[PDB]
A paper describes a structure:
Aquaporin-7 (AQP7)—together with AQPs 3, 9, and 10—belongs to the aquaglyceroporin subgroup of the AQP family based on sequence homology and permeability to H2O, glycerol, urea, purines, and arsenite. Moreover, AQP7 is abundantly expressed in human adipose tissue, where during lipolysis it mediates the efflux of newly generated glycerol. Structurally, all AQPs share a tetrameric configuration with each functionally independent monomer composed of six membrane-spanning helices (H1-H6) arranged in a right-handed helical bundle. H1-H6 and two short α-helical segments (HB and HE), provide the framework for the internal monomeric pore with its selectivity filter (SF), built in AQP7 from residues F74, G222, Y223, and R229.
In our AQP7 structure, X-ray crystallography captures AQP7 monomeric pores in a unique closed state in which F74 and Y223 block passage of small solutes. Crystal packing analysis reveals 2 stacked AQP7 tetramers interfaced at the EV so that neither the N- nor C-termini participate in crystal contacts. Despite a resolution of 3.95 Å the high crystal symmetry (F4132) and additional presence of non-crystallographic symmetry (NCS) makes it possible, in symmetry-averaged maps, to resolve electron-density features of many amino-acid side-chains as indicated in Figure 3B. Uniquely in AQP7, the NPA motifs are NPS/NAA, eliminating the proline-stacking interaction characteristic of nearly all AQPs. The crystal structure of AQP7 reveals (a) the arrangement of the NAA (94–96) and NPS motifs that form the NPA constriction in AQP7, where the van der Waals packing of A95 and P227 in AQP7 replaces that of the conserved prolines in GlpF; and (b) that residues F74 and Y223 in the SF establish a wedge that excludes glycerol, suggesting that our structure captures a closed state. The SF of AQP7 can exist in two alternate states, one represented by our structure, with constriction diameters of only 2.1 Å or 2.2 Å in each monomer, and an alternate state revealed by MD simulations, with a constriction diameter of 3.5 Å. Although H2O would permeate through the narrow SF constriction in our AQP7 structure, the hydrophobic wedge formed by F74 and Y223 in AQP7 cannot accommodate the larger glycerol molecule. Moreover, 2Fo-Fc simulated annealing omit maps show clear average densities consistent with glycerol in all 4 monomeric pores of AQP7. The two NCS-related AQP7 dimers comprise two monomers with 3 glycerol molecules (Glycerols), and two monomers with 2 glycerol molecules in the monomeric pore. Interestingly, monomers with the inward-facing Y67 orientation house only two glycerol molecules, whereas monomers with the outward-facing orientation of Y67 have three glycerols. In stark contrast to GlpF, we observe no ligand electron density at the selectivity filter of AQP7 (SF).
Numbering used by the authors:
A (entry chain A), B (entry chain C), C (entry chain A), D (entry chain C): 32 to 280
The structure:
């Protein structure tokens, strides 16, 4: 049943965003002591609930890039890939809407205090990822592909039962721990936008909620690299597994 | 027998408060370096000990709402729901008393130094949850309903053995990290008062311990929303499971 | 084989102290950002390695109080109890000696800078536990018995295989998590001196390393309550298990 | 085959550096709020991903000393030890290069702002470990030998299936938390340079990247003690197991 699979992908990427976008909205509009580790450990734990909640029906894709890499390297149906990508896009667009509906007055009061009419530099940083001042567009690629490819290589190493002792239940906890490490050690280079649907659907909402063109560009065009560099990174990560380790098991 | 269930619900909600109220009492009266994540991670870990201790004989109903939603969607005995709720109330009222008996002089010295005669503004924040300055009564509902409904939806997804990775033992640990995420990403909006018995029984004690009406109102009528918003949130979260995922298993 | 059991109890309480005493020496003599959670999470993780390392031969007692409670409530040989208590006393006295041998110059330079001739108020706080200014001797009892009794009731609930799904390997990780919660929510009341041998053997060393009478008294006599209140608390915690929950499984 | 083992030791020590060097590079060039625990917890979690990824074909020898001690006490092929060590060196030299390629402009802007021409005093602290101002060369030995010997003694106790609770899958996670404890309780004494290949291959890169002699000496001759003290510590830790516990199983 497909609408069985789609429905979980809507909700499970939601849990990811509300738990991932909630913790950063808490950071900029709620004066919370959130350190780099406190946003990664909560995001990685949140993506683990997304694995736990929606494991049975989908396999917990929650990523347009791990779905495109499971088709090219994991014999997942190509008939399922478009229906999947449109569901965890819509599930993240609605995720941002509810976290802004619950923080509604935290925006108008933080912006009112700091006299931010255009928040496309700090406040929108909550919904989706944005580059640091000290790098540029082609550097985000190298950063997003090299990390999404490392996610794909553990996501295959944890689900690989022909590898070190299989983790019956601890699989989803370490997949979180993994992104915790990628967000803690490289999250400040691009925001660890591992997922094209973790970053674009919130942008199209933030576009709606009064941020405009700058939600896509982010000063210097930035919406391309969250959508294409992860898809170009998860494939590089999937091939290097089946060749460098999978051909060795 | 039933007096087994009640006795554990008394003790198991106790473990929650003393571990949860202890960690925040440490914040205002013991000059501890405690972040939002360190109080959520300690509360969620504490609720996990509450699952572990009193799971085999109770099912770990540490929530007047998780009991009311397991009765409406989990065929729990309706004869057991009132007796269940009175043990987890009395177990939390006694929980606050022991943590106030152990911190007794930390109150009288903190207030004596800061000339706090009426502490229903900061210090009672220890026992139960209180709204932030920037929102109001109808705002707690959206926050408490939308989050208790996210709790109920994992608490069902974690105990769902027809969802792919079965968690033999990691169930109670992942329920903890879940509230760690809800307290870290939305805990400053209402205090994540997910349980009507996590918030009312400590208030009736703080009422006794010299805080007065303001323990119930907290500036504005804040004792209603912990008691009614979780119950209306756990039902929405329980129906949203069996409809959006359960009809998807 | 007994010297088989003793040898592990020497070493496994060592691992506890070096990992537990190391993190606090790092706090006072090495200017490390250690928050209340960073000392509890590292101690609880350290006591978990102590369970992991020395599980097979002893059962990971590491506590003169859990050994005296396993004899009265767990049919452990009374012939083994004295040989056990003298080993994880000596194992903690040597543990403090090596952590002071590695931090040797961090004492003489911190004391040299802060002109501390007598360090029995802050510096010795690293080796063993010491009361806060705002409570007294009879209050430490209530604090140490009520917490050591909560340790004993989880340590029995995690090893109880007739309770919720047994934790094959995750047992030792949650025993740490438990003390993490007791040190995070009540560690500032007495130092969570759960173990009589975690606190006395380091004192007899600190007595040696140039701290004198004040290592035992701590301003106001303090060495009695770490040694007797845990033994009086682990028994209260062991009886309440087999009666309030064990008689219900 | 052997070229399977080498290839994974290249990649698996890479994962360690990029996750370990990334998290501390974030500290000096990215103005991140990073505590001692947040860098140890991220390094130890990263070393756990190194165990998980390359366990089935290597056994996860991510340490020139853990290989040399598994050969002397674990009947590992002596023919495999040199080829093993050259892959985990080259894999760490390339690891630093990719984390310096991703942080490239964060160096030139941090040094340009702080007028750091020679950064072998703070910034190279990113790639490899460096002594603190308050100790000297013979002090690193006691610290590096006593800790690498504690690592080797758990790494054997975790993989010891004749020790009570067998950890099917939790093995790699608990090895991580162990170094989290060693980096949190003794990491400021030497940088917990437990692996000769965690500390030398990044230096030879930092030598290349414009840091010069001072990457090897670090004020005083500090490149020797990461290479020789771990090897002398892992042997003491391996013998202390099979003698104090292994003859106790």
């Amino acid at each position: 049943k497909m609408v069985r699979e789609f429905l979980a992908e809507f909700m499970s990427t939601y849990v990811m965003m509300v738990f991932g976008l909630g913790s950063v909205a808490h950071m900029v509009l709620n004066k919370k002591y959130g350190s780099y580790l406190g946003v990664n450990l909560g995001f990685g734990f949140g993506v683990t609930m997304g694995v736990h909640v929606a494991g049975r029906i989908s396999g917990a894709h929650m990523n347009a890039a791990v779905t495109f890499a499971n088709c090219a390297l994991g014999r997942v149906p190509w008939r399922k890939f478009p229906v999947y990508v449109l569901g965890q896009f819509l599930g993240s667009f609605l995720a941002a809407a509810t976290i802004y509906s619950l923080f509604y007055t935290a925006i108008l009061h933080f912006s009112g205090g700091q006299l931010m009419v255009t928040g496309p530099v700090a406040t929108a940083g909550i919904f989706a990822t944005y580059l640091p001042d000290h790098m540029t567009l082609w550097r985000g690629f190298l950063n997003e592909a090299w990390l999404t490819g490392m996610l794909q290589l553990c996501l295959f190493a944890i689900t690989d039962q022909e590898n070190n002792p299989a983790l019956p239940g601890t699989e989803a906890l370490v997949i979180g721990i993994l992104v915790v490490i990628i967000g803690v050690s490289l999250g400040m280079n691009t925001g660890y936008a591992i997922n094209p649907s973790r970053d674009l659907p919130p942008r199209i909402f933030t576009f709606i909620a009064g941020w405009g063109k700058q939600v896509f560009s982010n000063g210097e065009n930035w919406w391309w690299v969250p959508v294409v560099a992860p898809l170009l990174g998860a494939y590089l990560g999937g091939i290097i597994y089946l060749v460098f380790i999978g051909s060795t098991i």
